[PDB]
Amino acid sequence: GPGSKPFTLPILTIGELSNSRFPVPIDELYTSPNEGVIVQPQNGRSTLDGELLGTTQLVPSNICALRGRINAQVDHHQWNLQVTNTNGTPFDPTEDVPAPLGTPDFLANIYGVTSQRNPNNTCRAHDGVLATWSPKFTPKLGSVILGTWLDLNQPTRFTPVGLFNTDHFDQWALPSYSGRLTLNMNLAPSVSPLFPGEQLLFFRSHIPLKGGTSDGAIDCLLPQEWIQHFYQESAPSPTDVALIRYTNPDTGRVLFEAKLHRQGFITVANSGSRPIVVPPNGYFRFDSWVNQFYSLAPM
Amino acid sequence: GPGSKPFTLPILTIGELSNSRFPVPIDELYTSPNEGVIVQPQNGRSTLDGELLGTTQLVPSNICALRGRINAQVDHHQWNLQVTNTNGTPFDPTEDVPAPLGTPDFLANIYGVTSQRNPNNTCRAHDGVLATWSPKFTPKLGSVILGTWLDLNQPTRFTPVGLFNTDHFDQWALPSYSGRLTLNMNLAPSVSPLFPGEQLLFFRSHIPLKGGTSDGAIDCLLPQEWIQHFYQESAPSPTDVALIRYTNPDTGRVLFEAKLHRQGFITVANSGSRPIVVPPNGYFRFDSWVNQFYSLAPM
Numbered sequence: 178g179p180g181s182k183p184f185t186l187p188i189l190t191i192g193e194l195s196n197s198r199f200p201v202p203i204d205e206l207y208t209s210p211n212e213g214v215i216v217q218p219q220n221g222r223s224t225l226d227g228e229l230l231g232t233t234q235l236v237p238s239n240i241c242a243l244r245g246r247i248n249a250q251v252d253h254h255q256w257n258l259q260v261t262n263t264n265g266t267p268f269d270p271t272e273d274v275p276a277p278l279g280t281p282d283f284l285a286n287i288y289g290v291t292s293q294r295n296p297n298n299t300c301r302a303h304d305g306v307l308a309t310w311s312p313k314f315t316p317k318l319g320s321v322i323l324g325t326w327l328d329l330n331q332p333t334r335f336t337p338v339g340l341f342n343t344d345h346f347d348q349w350a351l352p353s354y355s356g357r358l359t360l361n362m363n364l365a366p367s368v369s370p371l372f373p374g375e376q377l378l379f380f381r382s383h384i385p386l387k388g389g390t391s392d393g394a395i396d397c398l399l400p401q402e403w404i405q406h407f408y409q410e411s412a413p414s415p416t417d418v419a420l421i422r423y424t425n426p427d428t429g430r431v432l433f434e435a436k437l438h439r440q441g442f443i444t445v446a447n448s449g450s451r452p453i454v455v456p457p458n459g460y461f462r463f464d465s466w467v468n469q470f471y472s473l474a475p476m
Numbered sequence: 477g478p479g480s481k482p483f484t485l486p487i488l489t490i491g492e493l494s495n496s497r498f499p500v501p502i503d504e505l506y507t508s509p510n511e512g513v514i515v516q517p518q519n520g521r522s523t524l525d526g527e528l529l530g531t532t533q534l535v536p537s538n539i540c541a542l543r544g545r546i547n548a549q550v551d552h553h554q555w556n557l558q559v560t561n562t563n564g565t566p567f568d569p570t571e572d573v574p575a576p577l578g579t580p581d582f583l584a585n586i587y588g589v590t591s592q593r594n595p596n597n598t599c600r601a602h603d604g605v606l607a608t609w610s611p612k613f614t615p616k617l618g619s620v621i622l623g624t625w626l627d628l629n630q631p632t633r634f635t636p637v638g639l640f641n642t643d644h645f646d647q648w649a650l651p652s653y654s655g656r657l658t659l660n661m662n663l664a665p666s667v668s669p670l671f672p673g674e675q676l677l678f679f680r681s682h683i684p685l686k687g688g689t690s691d692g693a694i695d696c697l698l699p700q701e702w703i704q705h706f707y708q709e710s711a712p713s714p715t716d717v718a719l720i721r722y723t724n725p726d727t728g729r730v731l732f733e734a735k736l737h738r739q740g741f742i743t744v745a746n747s748g749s750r751p752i753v754v755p756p757n758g759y760f761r762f763d764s765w766v767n768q769f770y771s772l773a774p775m
Binding site: 409 | 535602
């Protein structure tokens with residue numbers, strides 16, 4: 178067709194979406210005022226024309242994963258991992274990113290498995306914890322600590338599974354990527370509704386918790402598939418806001434409408450903290466470009 | 477443009493691809509004659525015009541995952557899981573699929589984590605083994621056995637991590653989805669090169685192994701992203717074979733060419749079992765439609 182490539186959403190139902198901040202499926206849509214909180218995730222960040230931001234990368238299984246080599250042993254239950262990029266290349270701290278792509282963007286004791294394969298194909302794997310709140314969590318400097326309950330200088334991967342416990346768990350608190358005394362850099366910006374009566378719309382997952390009491394909520398601004406889609410398409414954004422409507426393809430009915438902002442987040446006309454139920458066959462549909470002053474029908 | 481949607485590949489480097497048969501990144505390209513083996517994976521199967529086959533579904537984190545409820549305990553280290561679909565809907569055994577979508581398609585002791593969340597948000601998770609070779613591995617009948625080292629009638633998920641050990645491990649041996657005495661049904665067909673001098677080209681990952689000696693090779697016919705891409709695009713296939721060339725975008729050089737078949741697999745002109753090294757910035761490029769008798773340049 179003529180002119181600029183048209184903007185599109187992938188056609189995916191809620192059961193066909195992945196969380197972009199933790200490697201699990203989306204469970205539900207959620208809206209909240211998030212009173213008192215700065216919402217600034219670094220994974221799951223992209224503009225509508227496909228510019229990845231923060232620590233966002235494309236591979237779902239690399240989300241919250243770490244890769245590298247163990248150079249030493251701390252505390253015999255702790256190991257020093259010299260981080261590389263999730264794709265194998267060494268990590269250059271001078272790169273204009275907050276941390277290696279896919280690095281966890283929240284404070285937690287992350288339950289996972291540390292595994293190695295030696296050149297002679299002898300292997301080991303042990304479950305353990307990655308403490309992203311720890312003073313020794315310094316991925317931007319090129320190292321983190323892995324805990325276990327391992328061979329030195331062998332190819333190593335940490336596969337995240339969930340939360341070990343609820344201690345230190347704050348999904349909206351960023352890690353100190355270079356350690357506690359150092360500023361984070363090259364961050365994706367914080368996000369907020371800019372129009373009165375509006376709240377953020379999240380794609381929510383409830384991640385596994387080894388022990389304790391929590392809904393384990395991880396909220397992402399965009400599902401991983403949307404990010405992958407925008408990256409491929411790279412469709413220009415004529416205005417700052419795309420108008421999207423959640424549509425039931427069978428009936429043709431529109432359940433609600435939302436603002437998809439150019440910087441990569443969604444707002445809806447709603448109030449309070451609540452899950453938003455959608456039909457299993459329904460999906461978001463891009464209808465037209467509008468501006469920041471468009472007035473959404475209340476949900 | 478005019479006429480039928482044009483066929484395209486997503487532009488993704490090898491470091492930007494996911495395995496469609498196990499939830500891990502692609503490590504390398506691999507080719508092999510696979511002498512003596514029937515190559516019939518059920519995950520990672522799609523036609524070029526986006527028809528998913530076998531047990532293939534879209535969500536990467538649902539690959540080799542299971543979901544359901546535990547109604548009883550066998551052997552107190554064994555639990556009976558009544559499987560649902562990975563998206564939470566109940567599984568109907570009369571559906572025209574070999575098993576619930578995302579069910580593992582190979583024989584192994586799969587190391588993973590079983591987790592639950594109760595309505596009061598009290599949670600537990602324990603690592604364990606899913607034995608896909610077991611007589612009690614009957615997902616098509618609606619049940620499997622989960623091993624641990626758990627609450628009854630609570631929402632349960634098995635998150636795969638890797639191989640517990642190398643026993644029974646055969647990546648090309650399909651499970652008996654309804655148990656040992658029953659035929660598998662609705663299978664994606666076996667695949668083979670149909671032109672002399674040609675071999676299958678695989679997207680290979682080396683998955684974690686808790687203990688033992690193995691390269692842990694899992695070979696998929698198409699990366700998960702290609703499957704997701706074809707599903708969205710649904711571009712018609714004018715002929716049975718698409719001609720693709722691995723191209724270095726910087727230089728413009730073509731390293732090698734391959735046949736991308738309509739049924740969703742790749743062949744190359746090569747011999748023997750060997751890894752195929754590609755430049756980090758390179759990617760497959762669709763150049764034109766050809767037929768089954770096209771003669772590929774030797775690699």
